[PDB]
Amino acid sequence: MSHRKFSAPRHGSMAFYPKKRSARHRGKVKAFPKDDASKPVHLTCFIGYKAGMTHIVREADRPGSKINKKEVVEAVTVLETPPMIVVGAVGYIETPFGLRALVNVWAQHLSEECRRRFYKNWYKSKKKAFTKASKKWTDDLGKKSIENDFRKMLRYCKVIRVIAHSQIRLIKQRQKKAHVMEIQLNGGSIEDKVKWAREHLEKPIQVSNVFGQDEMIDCVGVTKGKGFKGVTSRWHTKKLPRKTHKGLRKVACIGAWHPSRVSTTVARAGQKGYHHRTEINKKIYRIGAGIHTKDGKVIKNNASTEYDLTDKSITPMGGFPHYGEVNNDFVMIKGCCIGSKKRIITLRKSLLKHTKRSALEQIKLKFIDTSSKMGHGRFQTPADKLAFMGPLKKDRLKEEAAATTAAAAAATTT
RNA sequence: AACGUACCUUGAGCAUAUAUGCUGUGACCCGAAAGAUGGUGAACUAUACUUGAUCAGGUUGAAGUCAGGGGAAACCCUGAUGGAAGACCGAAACAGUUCUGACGUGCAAAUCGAUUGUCAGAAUUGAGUAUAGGGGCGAAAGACCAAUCGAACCAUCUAGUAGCUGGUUCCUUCCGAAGUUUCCCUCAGGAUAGCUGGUGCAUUUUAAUAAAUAAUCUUAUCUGGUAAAGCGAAU
RNA sequence: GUUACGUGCCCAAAUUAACAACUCAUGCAGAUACCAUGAAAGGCGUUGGUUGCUUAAAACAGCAGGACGGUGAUCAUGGAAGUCGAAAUCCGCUAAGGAGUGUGUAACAACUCACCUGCCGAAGCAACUAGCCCUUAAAAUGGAUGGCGCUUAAGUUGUAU
RNA sequence: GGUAUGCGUAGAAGUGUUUGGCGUAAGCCUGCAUGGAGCUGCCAUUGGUACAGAUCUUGGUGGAUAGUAGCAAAUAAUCGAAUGAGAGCCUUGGAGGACUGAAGUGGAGAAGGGUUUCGUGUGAACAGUGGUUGAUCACGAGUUAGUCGGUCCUAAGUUCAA
RNA sequence: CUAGUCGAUAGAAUAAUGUAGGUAAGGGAAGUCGGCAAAUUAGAUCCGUAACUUCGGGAUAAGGAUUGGCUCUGAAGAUUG
RNA sequence: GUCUAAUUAAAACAAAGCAUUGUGAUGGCCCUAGCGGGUGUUGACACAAUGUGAUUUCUGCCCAGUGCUCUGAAUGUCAAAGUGAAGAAAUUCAAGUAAGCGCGGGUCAACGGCGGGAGUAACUAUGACUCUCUUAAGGUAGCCAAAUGCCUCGUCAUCUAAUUAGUGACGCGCAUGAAUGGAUUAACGAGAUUCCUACUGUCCCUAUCUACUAUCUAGCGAAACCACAGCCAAGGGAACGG
RNA sequence: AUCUCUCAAAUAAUAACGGAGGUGUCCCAAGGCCAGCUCAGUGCGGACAGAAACCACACAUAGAGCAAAAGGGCAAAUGCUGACUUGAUCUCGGUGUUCAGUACACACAGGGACAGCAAAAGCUCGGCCUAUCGAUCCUUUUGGUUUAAAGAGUUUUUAACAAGAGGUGUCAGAAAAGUUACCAUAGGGAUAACUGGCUUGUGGCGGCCAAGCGUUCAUAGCGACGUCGCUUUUUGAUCCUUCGAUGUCGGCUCUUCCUAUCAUUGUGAAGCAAAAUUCACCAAGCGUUGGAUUGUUCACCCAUGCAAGGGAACGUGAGCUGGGUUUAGACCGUCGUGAGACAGGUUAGUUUUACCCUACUAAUGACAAAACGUUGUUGCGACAGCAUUCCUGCGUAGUACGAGAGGAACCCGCAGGUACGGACCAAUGGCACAAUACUUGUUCGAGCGAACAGUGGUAUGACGCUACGUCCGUUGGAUUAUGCCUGAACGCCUCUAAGGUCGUAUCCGUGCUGGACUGCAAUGAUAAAUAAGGGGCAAUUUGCAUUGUAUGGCUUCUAAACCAUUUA
RNA sequence: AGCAGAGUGGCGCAGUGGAAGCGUGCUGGGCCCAUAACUCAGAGGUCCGAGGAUCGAAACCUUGCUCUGCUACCA
RNA sequence: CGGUGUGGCCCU
């Protein structure tokens, strides 16, 4: 009569949770797969934006399952991302109190749309950074500054990370400012990274050398937030019965009598969502590269794989809702990328040692549903729309007056 | 000459001032449920009376009457016409049920909002008039009698009593207890001795510039059945 | 100026120009009377003992030889013949071989013990008694020698100054 | 009541005090600053005599808040013009949206109110917000009868000639 | 419509919980003290009506069908015959 | 139809009906400090006082205890005045001696009552029976684990996937019962007690949307309450601290 | 009130609703006192003669009697018997134990008298001593032959003094029946129901020795007869705190901790073949349910489960609920004559305030402080939290194994699934752009609307938001339980005596979420104006002025060593 | 826990210190054509157990055993 | 004019 009498779950796993609105809007990488050699000598992570979910058809190559050699429709998430710019390289050393940051010099030519993370009122600004520090590539520079410090990366340093832009200007968004992110090189024999990084300043980096077909990846970013929701939903605690003046929808018993306190674990009224989140080992499906300028028009293999062969793009008709003009190159990953609309989402490499079968299975995909989401799928492409539907008293049928006036245009000159 | 005496055995009281108590009225202080003598109000409400007044539209067909039809008579038989009953569902009139929902420092010293019952009579009601504080009145609950009802309401005899609780106001110096026996319709209190404090007063070669005492051991002398024993004594 | 509790340190005073031994703890080893704990019963855990034996005619441990017949006389036939269990009952043999020690051996047997001697040659062994540790000994908020802590002690004991 | 040829508008009582001091202590003495008319010391007496308290009486005043609680029922107000020191109102008048629905938030009667009805004029409390108008004040007027009605008659009943 | 009112502190603002008005795919009392808040039913015509009855009921039993708008015919009267 | 107005609307109340009870006027019931009033503008088919409760259907036995009246045959009590005797007298007794209570009946639709013991049937079990005990007379006709049976979560079918319940029937019934009223009851309930039919966010389990609040801002602006007061553990304590 | 025996620790005194009891009487002899004469028993006896009578004789230290309870005394008595008599008398005052050294009462020694027995001396002022009992007011006798009646007689009455008696057993003395669930008050923890608290007969709870059982076999598992021990869930105990109020029983929601462990991980035991199951050590990490009646904890079902364990601040009413219970209505059965109780049954009933301060979820943040600025961006982790879970099938195979029957769902791999956990929305489910189409009622004269019915009702309905859908949820390092490793003091062995190792959902760490609220790291910018200033470079070149430190020139120092795994 | 108590012939009861009391059964005969009824006759008692006191106890006393009554709390 | 019940089952 005084001990629970039906033991049960609790709700809301107290590990994650002092559950506050995060200390960072960026994607804090939190860690990297440690220091491995004969491994991805190149980068550890990448900078991605979120722009919707687009419905992939495929099948797997399982052992004797119940869908084995039988085709399915599993959801995908587009974490679109343009290439980035590397402009500096930070070295590190080791204390018994932590991993102290020692040396980085930035490259001499920052991007103007990445010269904004340092200011805050840029319309008011006189645009005076980097004035002083960038002219350190104009002096003697090596006997005093750079090869001194590069030797300090050579002699002293062990863990080198490099810094990275996010070329936001190639996605038309209402944000219009960069996102500086650290990225760690992960080879061995540190001077090979110094030879790597000193040639990788002021150069672009696209996802091709960073990622490929059928890799695992981790979606470290912010979540969509909510705001101050309640007590009944904010950890999924049940309804008290109907009769409750003082609440159909609150949590009853907060402590016992003794001791004379209130713990932090009790179901409390506390801010919902907008935490930091990451779940790990999300599986890549498709990488593509579809802007322009290869021979002529390029947009192909995005709306298609080799069983539909119809080009248009991974764009919907009228684009992803609240997000959607995928101009750039992009990746295609799995069920629920985290974070709301238009986000900033970081993606570091995986950490487990996969003996699970359902990580390594290489398969193509079969069909990308290129429909809207602002409606429902009744067609596929607006190019295909004139196959079913014929004349339409609109631009389909208004253009016959634009034809007789074009016929009157030759009658105008003659 | 035996014994009782508040008795004289050469006198000591009064007159007041002071201080401490004990006692009698306001009896250190305020305090209670109630008892009394007088007047008081039916202006909600119990309630009869008088005289006024109002309470929509709707379904169910009571006697009585009405020919058609059967049959020997008694007459049985559908059809209507007829609008009666403390009859029904419902509205302003009223009531107040379940939600135990809305405020519970209200809209309020009892109301609002959903819901539910009667609704042509034991009905509903404006005015006039009766009924009175240990009684009026009560289709009966000790309901109601002016926000009070197992006795109101307002001034007194009323600073009514309390073994029962609260507070019982300036400083230092000196001294420093009780919680026990008895008695008592006492067992939460009082008297009673006990302890304490005060007031001096008589005096020691134990009081004034011992050969006399009162308290602890000795010395000596009586005093008890508890340990320890004791069952090869009683019981 | 100096004392009836106590000095590693918060704590004022010794980690004493005072030591002899004590006690190893794997989930509270213990720590200053009342006082805020621990019993019944063990220990090839240790350290002190009392009483028994036995050994230099060399013991223990340790590896060598024998181990039955008179007699299957006999008790026991689910076997008794040495042997589930035996009334009995000696001896012969011999340094040492017993109507017998034997694996829930039903017969004969097989068979090693006891025993004596080889072998090694200074201590060994039986119960007994009682210091600490040791098992005992299980509570709900997480925290108690009073905390920090200690271990040829700051510890449980007798004590010097 | 006796007393000190007692100080007192050339500042007497209390009130403050970072002036100074006496007692073991209660308490005084003292300097300055208010203040404006009366006061204390010795010794005899003495009364309704000193307060932290009484769920103490009365009168200010806190924190919470002096800006939190909450002013959430009755469909719901709106631009433009005034005027005004200043207008979401009310204060109007111009539009024009919706309510009250004739068992009304409409027009006039009873009991009770008692000058509220009306014009004129307005500053502050009054109208749990404002305020130029108000059921507040200021200041003026305002209710006409033979027929409307009290008046007569009597009803239950006041017990009301001796 | 007729009469009269905007009089209930205001411009703003999409948090909980509460305050009242709701719908929610499956099953449908398991829920909880309990079928209580809440849902279906609701008007009228046409049938169709069970046991028990004091033969007045129970009776709206239950159990059902039917029900717009628009275009028409059929019927129920009065005066002068 | 009525009531607890402000927590009890119902199983309390209220009937209609039915059997009683006093009274023929000098009256019965009754207010009355006293004089005169109410019942009563009246008169047993009227008044007064009751217990019940439509009706349908039957009113079980008992007058001991007290309540009660009596056309009540009454030496056993019994008061003053008044009458007798003694006594100088206050006083002492005598003869007396009415109503009451006791005494004699009548009565329960007046309160309230309405037992156990052994034995006993060609199995057992029983008890149709037989004996005895004792009372004012022994619970009768019907009901029932009833709204009322401690033992209780009774014993038995059924409703149920599985039911301390609700129905049925069974009677040793702690303490069932005939107007302190018994047993059936048709019509209605803001009545309780359970299983179907319909059913729906009651729930499995929350999903969301509109109405004004908070909230935030401009005016407005208080109240209870408060030793000063706020970081917990273990130990002490007046024994669950700040 | 009152009496004894102890309780009482050797004077006395004395406790509780401690133990054993007793008393409200009884006796003209059971009194007073002289006289004779000794019983309890038991032996041998004796017509009828035993347990039977009555006589006789011995032993008779009291083993009896003494009115009564129990103690004490008691031997030519204090008993048996006998004689004879009223001292169970009048009187005066003191003294004993009750204690205040009171009163009553009861005993005791006198002085005086009058006697009574005995020859005398003596003995006697009631029972052999510890009980065998009462104060005023009056009523009332007995009384001197007594005074008073207030002017004086006489006579009767009352009145008084003195001894008793009628009487007060709640025993120092009122005359005395009930209940209030309509109840109103002074108060009390001096005194309970509830919550805590020490205690544990009660019960859950283990230990030990083995009488036996277990076919044999005491000890696999068991363990009787008896032996001794912890917990606080109840069950009483007790009265320590709150009576000027601690809102007291259940379920719901909900954090938590707890081992005496149900089942899951790692073993070991067996009468452990296997399957199955039992024992026992370590182990709190997730798990321990959906329902019928009841108001429940338990109880008992039905079912899932390859499987359903106990417990904590009476957890919790400013979170509810109010079904019981513990007010006011109301019926019933008995018990009381009744108003009226019923740890028995029915039904009906207001369940209140938070804005205070910490506590806690989320919200922003300052002067200052500091190996220093105003302000960036990008970093590090001390630090605190810590969550994934267990089943299932198919292989493994009818294989091993087992005589077979049965059966390793063995190790692992594969597929899946449960619960929570973290999230998103493409599709599908929900809710509605109250946008739009059909639409009733009324006004807008008629034709558009959605004009208004506080959202008219209806159907579809995109953004979102959401669950019923979706995608996900992991790896390092020690080391208990344990097996072994080598090895002696203990010549042998031997898992320890020190030593190297195999190992768990446990615990620690990565892994994931907040971060000395404002700790920390490098790193960017560094001003108005460029007339004039501002700000650095400055630790400085340049004086005045101040602090600090070696204070008598030095109570300075110096920042360069003692392995480079590890040892009395 | 006081207390109302009771326990007697096979069974039922009556019995207040001098007795073993009544009735029904049970037992025998007569009566009967045979069984019942009828008639005569006989038989039937640690008086619940252990004690108390005494001239004697079923009764008087308390004490235990059996058994109702009868309401009360809560090692 | 007083009372008076009962007779195990089957035998040309």
From Swiss-Prot:
Chief location bin: cytoplasm
UniProt name for this protein: Large ribosomal subunit protein uL3
Protein family according to the UniProt entry: Belongs to the universal ribosomal protein uL3 family.
InterPro entries attached to this UniProt entry: L3_arc_euk, Ribosomal_L3_dom_3_arc_sf, Ribosomal_uL3, Ribosomal_uL3_CS, Transl_B-barrel_sf
Pfam families: Ribosomal_L3
Signal peptide: none
Gene Ontology cellular component list: cytosolic large ribosomal subunit; cytosolic ribosome
Function: The L3 protein is a component of the large subunit of cytoplasmic ribosomes.
Lineage of origin: Eukaryota, Metazoa, Ecdysozoa, Arthropoda, Hexapoda
UniProt-annotated location(s): Cytoplasm
Recorded GO MF terms: RNA binding; structural constituent of ribosome
GO BP, sorted A to Z: cytoplasmic translation; translation
Keywords: Cytoplasm, Ribonucleoprotein, Ribosomal protein
SS bonds (residue pairs): none
Matching SUPFAM superfamilies: Translation proteins (SSF50447)
